[PDB]
Amino acid sequence: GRSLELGAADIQDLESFEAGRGALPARAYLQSDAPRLSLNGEWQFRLSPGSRVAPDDGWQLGEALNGFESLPVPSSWPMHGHGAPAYTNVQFPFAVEPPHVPEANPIGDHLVVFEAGPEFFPHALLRFDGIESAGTVWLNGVELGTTRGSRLAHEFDVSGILEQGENTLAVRVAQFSAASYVEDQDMWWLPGIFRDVTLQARPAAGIDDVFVHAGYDHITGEGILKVEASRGGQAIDAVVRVPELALELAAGTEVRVPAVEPWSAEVPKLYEAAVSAAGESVALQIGFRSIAIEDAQFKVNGRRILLRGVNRHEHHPRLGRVVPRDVVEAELRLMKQHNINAIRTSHYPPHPQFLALADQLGFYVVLECDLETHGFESAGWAQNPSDDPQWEDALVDRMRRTVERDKNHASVVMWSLGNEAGTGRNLAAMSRWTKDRDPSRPIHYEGDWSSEHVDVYSRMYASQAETALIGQGIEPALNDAALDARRRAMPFVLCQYVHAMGNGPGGMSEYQALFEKYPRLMGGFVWEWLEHGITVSTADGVDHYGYGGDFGEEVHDGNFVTDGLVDADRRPRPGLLDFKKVIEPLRIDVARDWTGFTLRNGQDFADTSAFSFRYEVEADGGALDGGTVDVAPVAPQSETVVELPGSVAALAAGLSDGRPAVLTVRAVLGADSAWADAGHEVAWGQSVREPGAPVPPAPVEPVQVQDSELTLGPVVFSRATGMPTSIGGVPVEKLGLTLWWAPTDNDLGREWGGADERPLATQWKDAGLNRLHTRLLGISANPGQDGGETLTVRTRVSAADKQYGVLVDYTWSTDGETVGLRTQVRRDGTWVNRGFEVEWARIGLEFVLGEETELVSWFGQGPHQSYPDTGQGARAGWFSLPLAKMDVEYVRPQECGARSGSRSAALQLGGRTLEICGDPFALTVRPYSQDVLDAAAHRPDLKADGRTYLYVDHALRGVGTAACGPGVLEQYRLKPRDADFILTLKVRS
Amino acid sequence: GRSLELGAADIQDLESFEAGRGALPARAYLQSDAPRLSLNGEWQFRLSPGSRVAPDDGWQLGEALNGFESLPVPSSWPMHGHGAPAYTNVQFPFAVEPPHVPEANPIGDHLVVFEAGPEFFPHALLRFDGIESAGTVWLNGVELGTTRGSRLAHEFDVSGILEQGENTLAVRVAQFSAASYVEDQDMWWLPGIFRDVTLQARPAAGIDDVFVHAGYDHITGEGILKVEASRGGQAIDAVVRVPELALELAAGTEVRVPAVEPWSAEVPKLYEAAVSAAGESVALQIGFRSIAIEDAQFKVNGRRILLRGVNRHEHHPRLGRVVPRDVVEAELRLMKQHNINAIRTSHYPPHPQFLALADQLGFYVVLECDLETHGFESAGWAQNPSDDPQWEDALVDRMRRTVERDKNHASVVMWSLGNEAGTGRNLAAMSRWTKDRDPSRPIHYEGDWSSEHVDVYSRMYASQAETALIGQGIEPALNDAALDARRRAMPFVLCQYVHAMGNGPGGMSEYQALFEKYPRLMGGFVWEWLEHGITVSTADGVDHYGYGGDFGEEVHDGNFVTDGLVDADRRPRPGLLDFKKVIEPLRIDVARDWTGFTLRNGQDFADTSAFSFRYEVEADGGALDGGTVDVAPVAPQSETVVELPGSVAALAAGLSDGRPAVLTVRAVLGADSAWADAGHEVAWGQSVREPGAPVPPAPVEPVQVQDSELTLGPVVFSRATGMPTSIGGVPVEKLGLTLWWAPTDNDLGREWGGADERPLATQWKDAGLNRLHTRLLGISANPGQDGGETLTVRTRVSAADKQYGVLVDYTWSTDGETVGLRTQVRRDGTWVNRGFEVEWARIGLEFVLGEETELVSWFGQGPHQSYPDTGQGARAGWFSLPLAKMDVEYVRPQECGARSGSRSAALQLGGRTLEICGDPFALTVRPYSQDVLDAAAHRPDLKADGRTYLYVDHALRGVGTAACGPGVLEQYRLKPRDADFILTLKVRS
Numbered sequence A, B: 001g002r003s004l005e006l007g008a009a010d011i012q013d014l015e016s017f018e019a020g021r022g023a024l025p026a027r028a029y030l031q032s033d034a035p036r037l038s039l040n041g042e043w044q045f046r047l048s049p050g051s052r053v054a055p056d057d058g059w060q061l062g063e064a065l066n067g068f069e070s071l072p073v074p075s076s077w078p079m080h081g082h083g084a085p086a087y088t089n090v091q092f093p094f095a096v097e098p099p100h101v102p103e104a105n106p107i108g109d110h111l112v113v114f115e116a117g118p119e120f121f122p123h124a125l126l127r128f129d130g131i132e133s134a135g136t137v138w139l140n141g142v143e144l145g146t147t148r149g150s151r152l153a154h155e156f157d158v159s160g161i162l163e164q165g166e167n168t169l170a171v172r173v174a175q176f177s178a179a180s181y182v183e184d185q186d187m188w189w190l191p192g193i194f195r196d197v198t199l200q201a202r203p204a205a206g207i208d209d210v211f212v213h214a215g216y217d218h219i220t221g222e223g224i225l226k227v228e229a230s231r232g233g234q235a236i237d238a239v240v241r242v243p244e245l246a247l248e249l250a251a252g253t254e255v256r257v258p259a260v261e262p263w264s265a266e267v268p269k270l271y272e273a274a275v276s277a278a279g280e281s282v283a284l285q286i287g288f289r290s291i292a293i294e295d296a297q298f299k300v301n302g303r304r305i306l307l308r309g310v311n312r313h314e315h316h317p318r319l320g321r322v323v324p325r326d327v328v329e330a331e332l333r334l335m336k337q338h339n340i341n342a343i344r345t346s347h348y349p350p351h352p353q354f355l356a357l358a359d360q361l362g363f364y365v366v367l368e369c370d371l372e373t374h375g376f377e378s379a380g381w382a383q384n385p386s387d388d389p390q391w392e393d394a395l396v397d398r399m400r401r402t403v404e405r406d407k408n409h410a411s412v413v414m415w416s417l418g419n420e421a422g423t424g425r426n427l428a429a430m431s432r433w434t435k436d437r438d439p440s441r442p443i444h445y446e447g448d449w450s451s452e453h454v455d456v457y458s459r460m461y462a463s464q465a466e467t468a469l470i471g472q473g474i475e476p477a478l479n480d481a482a483l484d485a486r487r488r489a490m491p492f493v494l495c496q497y498v499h500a501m502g503n504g505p506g507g508m509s510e511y512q513a514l515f516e517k518y519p520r521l522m523g524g525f526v527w528e529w530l531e532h533g534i535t536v537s538t539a540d541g542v543d544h545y546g547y548g549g550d551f552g553e554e555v556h557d558g559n560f561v562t563d564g565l566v567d568a569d570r571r572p573r574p575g576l577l578d579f580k581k582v583i584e585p586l587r588i589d590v591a592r593d594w595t596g597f598t599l600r601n602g603q604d605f606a607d608t609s610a611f612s613f614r615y616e617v618e619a620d621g622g623a624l625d626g627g628t629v630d631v632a633p634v635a636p637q638s639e640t641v642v643e644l645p646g647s648v649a650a651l652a653a654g655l656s657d658g659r660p661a662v663l664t665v666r667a668v669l670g671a672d673s674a675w676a677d678a679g680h681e682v683a684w685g686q687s688v689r690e691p692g693a694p695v696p697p698a699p700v701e702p703v704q705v706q707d708s709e710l711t712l713g714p715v716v717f718s719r720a721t722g723m724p725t726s727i728g729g730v731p732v733e734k735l736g737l738t739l740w741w742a743p744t745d746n747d748l749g750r751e752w753g754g755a756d757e758r759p760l761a762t763q764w765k766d767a768g769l770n771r772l773h774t775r776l777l778g779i780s781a782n783p784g785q786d787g788g789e790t791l792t793v794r795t796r797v798s799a800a801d802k803q804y805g806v807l808v809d810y811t812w813s814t815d816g817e818t819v820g821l822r823t824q825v826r827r828d829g830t831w832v833n834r835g836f837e838v839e840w841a842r843i844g845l846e847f848v849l850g851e852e853t854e855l856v857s858w859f860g861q862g863p864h865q866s867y868p869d870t871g872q873g874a875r876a877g878w879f880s881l882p883l884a885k886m887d888v889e890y891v892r893p894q895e896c897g898a899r900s901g902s903r904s905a906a907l908q909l910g911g912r913t914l915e916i917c918g919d920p921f922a923l924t925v926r927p928y929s930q931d932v933l934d935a936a937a938h939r940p941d942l943k944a945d946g947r948t949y950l951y952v953d954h955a956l957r958g959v960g961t962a963a964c965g966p967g968v969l970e971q972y973r974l975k976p977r978d979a980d981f982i983l984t985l986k987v988r989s
């Protein structure tokens, strides 16, 4: 007998390999004077759990709809209480059997009534700029068609279906479809109509598409202009006017403009233009720039550029894939404020409004097609859509719509086929189509390392070492001599590098030095701009970001989606502050004698005339001198030495020895720009006169012995433990050696290579570093000075079930006012476990104080955190912060907040102040212990316990980027060693 | 200056390598007529966290004691609210730096006042039978000495210190000491005075020690008797009387008793004897037996024996290491009731009272010395006390006290040097001392595989395969020809095997067959007798067992201490019921034609005269015939064929075909024994006439089609899912294929060997077997019979992110009364993941019923659970249990309760009854889902949800012993395959 199952037809369509049906030809997104009506607003919405249960109750007619409630459109509907967001990284959340879909498939029925006036007749269309993942569209009950390609635009002719007056638009949206198999980006799965819905009139004698060709001849200064215009796919008579250039020309003819000012990210010159036919006029912004690959270099307007980039997803912590325009504008301004000049639209085209902002503010853009089949990799790429002939039309269509929509924007300097889609016939077809359609932009795609169908060689997270070999052109050959010759002639880009998850990223400086040294290196794009945190509100009302698994997912990838330089609300992480410094476009090297500074202009086109150069000398008491210096403009890629005013050097020469003083030279905007105000800091450099080494106090005070306690000046010691119980009145609950920290996200990633691929966090756990214990060996007093004495406490630190340890000796000294503490660490037995060497996170001390800290001040680096392979943006100076603001609000709490390179510190314990001095140490102050920090999965898990946890580290490990990419570089690793270091302590009430 | 730390002297003593000081010579535990006073009772107790804080406040004088509270003695003090028990398996809970102790070291001060009458003067002693781990003893403020060796006895002379009238006994007990390094058994760390404290008078002209030598000459039947007696270490004139043997002899002379009845575990003949001098008489029980190794066989009284053994720890779920005598007696009786004949005192000497019970009830005992340095293995045995000359005196002393205390007991047939202590000089010294002192008992020690200093070759958890090679004497040679020749001449024992943790142990039968086949194989001792569960009581008042980590331990090993054949309260696990059958001492093979049975006497000394042989024929209606048969006694190791009464065969011949009937033949005690009552079952065998295969119902009923539902007889199907929603009125919430079960403890252990060492539980998790999903492919009806039709539902089962799946087709048939269900499974793509083949736990169905089940009945195997490599004790029959009693109360909930080999089943869902028939299937019924079972860490985590979860399995995996030892044997593994199987269903209201 026949079939008896329900919904076979809906499901047959969802499983289709075809692109959408019924849509108009793909075209550019154009600003037109044609009437248009946004249908955005409050729609009606009904959710069904699958296609077999989705009602076929004539709901498209909008009459007697039961089960519908209001929903804003555009929206990601799980951000509004309908289902829940779900995060997977690589793994598909459904069985991998393309093109088939699971039974649990949220079906969202959307409906809106609207009014169409006579200006939309006789011809109009409906435009949808994004539907995830499969839409079926009805107007007044007549099926317009379907949509495939979730971040791509679709237009439907409504001529003869749209009626004057009231109309009813209905859209059935399936979360999962065959397209889901090619939309496996590392991000939240979020169904919805998440971009604009527009009704546009199409008057007769209008303009459907426009293709701007605006080249630049850097030898003559000429612009090369051709503006194509078409209607129904045929070239049409149109007039092109560019008033600023005194130009009137016909569409379709190439002309040479005698002297144009060229467009670049540094100088994003745009000329306002209009293309007009009888019934319609289109407004354009034209930036003249030519892109070329020459001598294995990526060049714009005749010059090799340096990409200073980020990977930009579209995410909002409360609206999902809907990013309000005001947030877009602000975040692009924030990027420019941190010296970013390039953006990759990972991994799909952005909102169409994005490109004009990129044109205007100035970014080199890698516009990527909506294609990613990452989940097929684990099966050896079996059934990969990228190589399956049945998917060719679907994938070419994705590329076509990507290219057509954005082809007029100067800011787009590369087209990208997709991301992590393997290699295959359909990728080659997408490349062939793009090269024929638009030869003016090189093609990018990292998935095929042979680079057979691209114009640049692209890699993700290649090590600093391999990048140096590539920059010199000495990487190993491809097996195919012809392909090897082609790839060696290509410039090289890191489409993703220095993974910015949690504490980090480390190793940015070593990449950047290579970028500057080797012309073949185009630069790199950080993974990634933002964390995809989703706001969650508790009963108390306290908000925190959630991540994978916080929404009930059966399969998920945890906090791997919170991996950005800013949080979901665009608050910078420390890594962004470091990144801005690393990529700063000018290098300022201040002379040790304070007589001047060397200034290198790292820009590619602009000189230094936009910048005001300012100097300031700061000391303990505050600013001693400051001013501005006149710098004759320095050409791009040129260098000069600038004399500073004689007062600065003279000031340096007059400082008594050991008095600390910091000279800072800054390059700030002389005037407001489109992205920041005058005085915004772009680059800086410093020369420091360091404070003298701290003088051990004279051991003049003796030790008082008592039954259970010992006193030495202001320090009171427990006689049973040997550690101090109070010092200057401030209670000390515990003092001991530390070798471990609460693992970062990087420490949770695998150290690939060698026989040991355990994450460092696991190595540490296996080794017992998280659970150290101390045995007291002895306490003795020894002859000091003029009757005084030192107190030596000998301990051994180890962990249960381990034979290795470190002997630790504390030697205390005091003159009644200052406390001298020498600490001496010595290995006892080999620190090897499970057959591998144990590494340390740190060599330091943990003071646990029985009172709360309100304020932390220090002299060293700041204001933000710094670790051995980070902190580039932390500058030398004097800093003071409330305790709450020493912490870093990572979504998963982890080690953070250390201030490396500190020379002195003051903790304000209410009425008293504790001072620490010493040779350079790292400083951390927290109101909770390391075990609470490690145990915490979200920030509300952190609770202050009334104490102060003070960490003084003589040595620190780097943080690296091991969550994805290289671990800590050799020079920053911390292997077990012997070590001795001195501190002074003082309590000033 | 001098030291300033506190408690250095106490700690210096705890770190001492010496044995105890001040104690009398080690001697036997003897029953004497000398006056004795137990000091057991309510003592006063004070706990301090370490030696540096333990008061030196003159507390030993018992006057003005502050901070003391009542505590029972004997006790493990963490079982009474003072600190907490802590469980570690191998790892030490302190840093490994012998002989040093951690700062956190519970110090327990014990004190008791008592009255000593004139019968304890002039000479008396104080006896301590166990202190964990280091005791210091004062009497009336005078230091008697110290104790080392936590499960060993110490006696102190109190002559001249004990006063007539009131006395004050004070004992300072440290949990940790240098001895802790040699007491690293896999068990709870439990400090305390955990065995008897006795005041014993020592009258003049008494007897301090006695050494019984009672040999047996199996050729002549003669006993060989010599009883040594000494005082102050010198041989003394004593008289030895043995009334039953008409003997009066002098101590110290060897005599030949003409005809003794020899002692064995099977026939534990004991002769009452008394050794007496003028001032003291000692009562003895003498069992005559000679032990010998001959022709690579372990022999007793001239014959090779088979050890049917368990490893017996001393544990009580509420008293710790204190085992009440009534529990000891009951558990030994329970052992005999399950055919056990041998006990290893893992891994220390037991309570001294244990040995006379072993003598009397009849066990071959391996008495092990208190020595285990397991925690040194992870460092390559660096610093192992067993090879460190500084520990020689400590370790010889442990062996000396072990041997001296128990040397008079016939039940001790082997001395063991210790457990998991590596190899070393001190072990060799312990062996040398023992061989010189007592050559009558072979020496055992598994730690040194070369067997250089032992008389038997011992291994733990050697595979069934390696055991078969050893039994044939073809294992590989040692590199030292001399040592190889010695070891090849040795018999072989598995001191630990078939690890009994959780569901299991599997593979017992394959070991046992080898034991019977190969004389060199002595048998084996199961690890272990009991689970060390500790009772925990919640606010509700519900008790459950806790394990490692349930008491706040920083380092622990979880539920690896709950790994026994009985729970902590001695309730049998299914593995014990299986074990009893596996080791049954008689083999009964019932003839297929029911005319008789073959009977092999597997005993070593006894014939079959103790046994009554009974038969019974059972059918659906109940017993059809039964009686007793007279078996002329069968000699040990002999065989005969016993005719059954003609009525039984005649009954068999008269059964209509397909009618099920079970013939059972049982060997029960003819009369009460010391360990069970008459009628206790010892062995059994069965012959079954199986029920006919179930007849598919005639497909005479058609399918009614409806908008959303389908009806076929009494089955109602959801049209959207294809699965039934009710059947006979009972609601069905879900039906689907299962391939996975909630991992057992064995499934959580590593499959050593191959490139894949992930535990099967992890293999499953990585593969998605725990999270299967089903896609509906189609539903169609097809021509049945006389207008009826079948309904076929086609599905595919897979998991998210996986390409492999199984196609499943359900074909339904009904004649209105019975429902026929054919299920057909077919692999689609290779079930490979992470580069390794995925194995299945099962091929079955899960019915989730929307109503509760009160009663489960079946015909198959029972009453207890059975899996492919277990269930030996489950016999064929008809069974019925309430739902609660289908479950197995393992401490960590896990897969359990399957009844393999079922042919029919009836679930009573209140007023209705669901019947299932089919070819052999496994049956499981639960009131909670598999995910709740897996998630649960303790039994209170299980919660009934109102449903019934019914599992019908066409195939099951074995359970093995992978938690420690071999995994599932090849023949019981379940690799992916195609499969088809049929069921019938019927609801009788």
Ligand SMILES: OC[C@H]1O[C@@H](O[C@@H]2[C@@H](CO)O[C@](O)(CO)[C@H]2O)[C@H](O)[C@@H](O)[C@H]1O
Pocket (backbone or CB within 6 Å): A089, A090, A185, A186, A346, A347, A419, A420, A460, A496, A527, A560, A563, A963, A964
């Ligand atoms: O956050 C990781 C980002 O990097 C890439 O994904 C990573 C791949 C690259 O082959 O390596 C892993 O670490 C393996 O799991 C991936 O996470 C993606 O291109 C980015 O979209 C993003 O996921």
Ligand SMILES: OC[C@H]1O[C@@H](O[C@@H]2[C@@H](CO)O[C@](O)(CO)[C@H]2O)[C@H](O)[C@@H](O)[C@H]1O
Pocket (backbone or CB within 6 Å): B089, B090, B185, B186, B346, B347, B419, B420, B460, B496, B527, B560, B563, B963, B964
């Ligand atoms: O419950 C395990 C029992 O077996 C032995 O310990 C195991 C050793 C044998 O070398 O192998 C391990 O599985 C490794 O961890 C141990 O658990 C002990 O002899 C027994 O006392 C007991 O622990």
Ligand SMILES: OC[C@H]1O[C@@H](O[C@@H]2[C@@H](CO)O[C@](O)(CO)[C@H]2O)[C@H](O)[C@@H](O)[C@H]1O
Pocket (backbone or CB within 6 Å): B025, B209, B210, B211, B228, B229, B230, B231, B232, B233, B234, B235, B436, B437
């Ligand atoms: O503690 C005295 C013991 O005497 C033992 O036997 C004598 C010892 C004394 O050196 O040496 C022997 O040869 C035994 O090895 C005997 O002559 C007793 O057997 C012990 O029980 C005990 O009495």
Ligand code: NA
Pocket (backbone or CB within 6 Å): B089, B186, B560, B561, B562, B563
């Ligand atoms: Na165990």
